[model samples]
Target: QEMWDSGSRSTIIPFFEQYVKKEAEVLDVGCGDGYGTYKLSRTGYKAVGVDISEVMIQKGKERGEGPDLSFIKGDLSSLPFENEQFEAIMAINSLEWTEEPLRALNEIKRVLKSDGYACIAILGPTAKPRENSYPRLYGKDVVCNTMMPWEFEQLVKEQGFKVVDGIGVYKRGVNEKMLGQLSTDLQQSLTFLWVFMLKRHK
Candidate 1:
């Protein structure tokens, strides 16, 4: 709901159309209800939604599968598919929930074709739920790891993924004029979400 309301999920189809070929196999990692995946299929991709939750996968299946759409139960750190399986991948606000973010990122890298593209959305610094990572200070176990958008950009670069395009989704009250006056780093700091269109470096 928040994802769609923020217009973040709406960016997927257009981004894919710009970079991915029609009928290409695309994986939607951590697809909660498969709504985004369904949208991708309608846009002409062979879209598969994979989630760690069985209930979500069941909900996705209830939406009905055909030649272009399907759902599977899978984990981020240990995905179910074979290596180099997908031509494209979409992971929206999913990486932060992993127990081992680096490992999960590697898993995404492993399954993506050498020349494949990936659209990744990371929760920005201003996102309220980022507090979930605060418990770690007291040695508590938490699902959400605090990785800022800039950090994620650096991480992907280190992991051999090059940024093709990117956008910052800002909260209400942040006007275009205010954003225009800020540096890219400051703009990212104020974002509610940050989406990166990426591809393998080599």
Candidate 2:
């Protein structure tokens, strides 16, 4: 968990606490282990989760799931839900595997409500590919369709979304990774955190 949490600690929980409004019908695309949804669920948002893997969702399902939280197994390329079904979405560490990043943003646009917003984070090309992601750096089967920060912002805009803001070049250390993995501490210290909002093109 520490390995993955290395990137997530920066903005995940705080992103929900910030943009997730009271009673909003929020959707979390690729809501692995229900972390982001759980955060918003406690904050009064209807935090529904959708993921492509039933195995992951099943393993992730834990008891004491609040009334506001729900999880469904589904894909991002073709979401199972209807149009404008969610008031907000949080997509973190999920888009790199997507077949098309721009079209991934399009699917997000389709399901999100007119005034909906999202906090999405994708992988940055590593200066040196590490244990889990060396394949992606070489454009291999890992499916790395990453881009510059500006390119990221543009992908969202081209799909009928409006860019709100972006954060950059943040760093987190190794000790906090161990703390977050133990689940005894909920500290987000490393990685970049960007909070971008979008709405239907009027």
Candidate 3:
């Protein structure tokens, strides 16, 4: 609950409020933990979230649920939604975690409506000399395939969408008055992913 409230207020909720209007049925891919999905539901969106973690799905059900929200356990690499089903879709700080980004983007495109737009806040880059370094952040055991800015833009475009907006988020000092915070290491990982607001285009 504390983490949910903090992230929504300072990090992404403000952005979501500006773009996501009332009663918009939205599909949130990689809706980890489901805090944001449930909050959006209160604002009038029929929010449906898909996550690969069964624990997260259950946790979300406990915290992020209301009449307007729903959750499913699934992988973002193969989203389980149908075409033209969502007014908008969101992938908040979630996209670059994919094992196959191109295939994931293709799936996102297929499920969106012809005129639908999406907010995709994916990672941008990693600290390694090579681009595909995955486990460099949390010591040598955790490798991740991080993408650079140009690579992110190009990859999404090649997968058949346009980059509509780009928002960069990193770790920073938080007021003690403020509750949750991103760890120092995870903050550095922020620069490792390219955060883009994307849309499926004609």
Candidate 4:
């Protein structure tokens, strides 16, 4: 909720408006509390937010239920939807939580229209929950897999998706001038979150 209020996630809405038609169906994967999904609805897209947590889904339904907005309890690796069901998808800071990120990506590909686009946000190395990866180093079980933003970019390309546009949300003190001089890879390295607008290869 703080992340949405901080205005980092909302930046992707403009990209959605530019790429997806108004009133098109948009799925929000791993939509905790559904705040972002609600925003998508308010922005005129038909939005549905799905999460594994029943509590979160209930909370989302309580506040965001409307003709254009809905919520469901589901998993990313096996989304409960038919093929090519959505015009666009938004999976913000959620892929890393999947037990199998590649399988989840395949599910995303399955549910999305070939002409549709997806906006994916990956947590950068500097994010506070870096501890999710630490347990693996100690030979303990862990659910969150740490995939760097650049690695995800490469993986998506290899998996038959193309990056249409992208931007990095940096922490304070990182000025635009400095970022402007660096490569896209370098920019991602400095971000707290890296958002990618992706399209499936035809």
Best by TM-score: 4
Q: Which structure among the candidates has the greatest lDDT? A: 4
Count of backbone collisions in candidate 2:
1
Instruction: Return whichever of 3 and 4 wins on TM-score.
Output: 4
Per-candidate count of clashing residue pairs (backbone under 3 Å): 0, 1, 12, 0
What is the C-alpha lDDT profile of model 1 across 1-202, one tens digit per residue?
A: 5555346566656766888889899999999998888888888999999998999999989888998999999988899999989999999899998777889899999999987899998988868788888889999998888887888889998998998887777877788888888877788888888788899765
Q: Estimate each model's TM-score.
A: 0.92, 0.75, 0.74, 0.95
Which should have the higher TM-score, number 1 or number 2?
A: 1
lDDT tens string, model 4, 1-202?
Answer: 6667656775777767778888999999999999999889989999999999999999899884888999999988889999999989999988888668899999998899896899999988887666778888779988778888999999999988989999888877899999989999899888888999999776
Lowest-sum lDDT 10-residue window in model 2: 182-191
How high a TM-score does candidate 2 get? Answer: 0.75
Superposed by TM-score, candidate 3 places the C-alpha of residue 133 at a distance from the truth, in angstroms, of 3.9
Pairs in clash, predicted candidate 4: none
lDDT of 1 at 75: 81
Superposing all C-alpha atoms, what RMSD in Å does each candidate have to the true structure? 1.8, 7.4, 6.8, 1.3
TM-score of 3: 0.74
lDDT of 3 by residue, 7-125 (tens): 43245555666666778788888888887788778667889988999999998898746668999998787777777778788876565565577777777888887667777765534
Clashing residue pairs in candidate 1, if any?
none
Reference-based lDDT, residue 92, model 1: 87
What stretches of model 3 exceed 4 Å from their correct place?
A: 1-4, 7-9, 124-143, 170-194
